[model samples]
Target: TYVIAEPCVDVKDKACIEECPVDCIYEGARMLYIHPDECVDCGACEPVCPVEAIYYEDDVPDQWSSYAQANADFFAELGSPGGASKVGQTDNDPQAIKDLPPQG
Candidate 1:
C-alpha cells in the first residue's frame, strides 16, 4: 500500500487523485487518501503528487506513519465506495484523522 505523507498536510495538491487508475484516492481529512483495499499498487500516483506526498508502505518516512494508518482507518467505515468514478466526492473525515496527533 502507498501512504500519504506529512508534506500533504494542507497542501493536498490532489494530482495523485487524477493519476490513480483504480480510483482509490479519496478526499479525507487534510489530504487525499489512497483506499487501502482498493489501491492497485500501480505506483501511478507517486509521480504526480506535486507535494511528493505518497510513499510505498515500506518506505514511508517515520514522521508520517499515521498517514498510513489514517488511510486504513479512514476507509474502515467508508469501505471502498466501489470506485471513485461512482462515488465522485465525499466530505467524510476519518476519526483517526479528526483526532490526529501532532507530528514531531
Candidate 2:
C-alpha cells in the first residue's frame, strides 16, 4: 500500500486518486485518504501525485511513516465501502486528523 504523507496535507491536488485503477483513494477536508485493504498495490497512483506526497509503505519519509496506518485507520472509522466508484465524493476524514498540523 502507498501512504499519503505531509506533502498531501495542504496540496490535495488529487492526481493520485485519478490514476488509481481500483478507486482506493478518498477525499477529506484537508487531504485525501488511501484505503489500504482496498488497494491493489499496482503503483499506478504514485507518479501522478503533483505534490509527490504518496509513498510505498516501507519507503515513506521518516516523519510521515505513521500515515500508512492513518490511511488504514480512515477506513476503520469511515467504514470501508469496498470501492469508491459507486460512493462518489465523500467529505469524511479520520480521527487522527486532529493530530496533524493545521493546513491553513
Top-TM-score structure, candidate number: 2
Model 1: per-residue lDDT, tens digit, 19-101?
88788888755667778788878998998887788999889988777778877776666776867677655656676566666
Clash count (model 1, backbone only): 0
- TM-scores for every candidate against the unseen true structure: 0.83, 0.85
**Candidate 2 C-alpha error for residue 102, in Å:** 3.3
The per-prediction CA RMSD against the true structure, in angstroms, equals 2.9, 1.8
Per-residue lDDT tens digits for candidate 2, residues 1-104, read: 87888788867887787788888888777678888887878899899887788888879988786788778776665687877777766556666774677874
Q: Candidate 2: deviation at residue 33, Å?
A: 1.2
Per-model clash counts, in order, read 0, 0
What is candidate 1's local distance difference test score?
0.76
lDDT of each: 0.76, 0.78
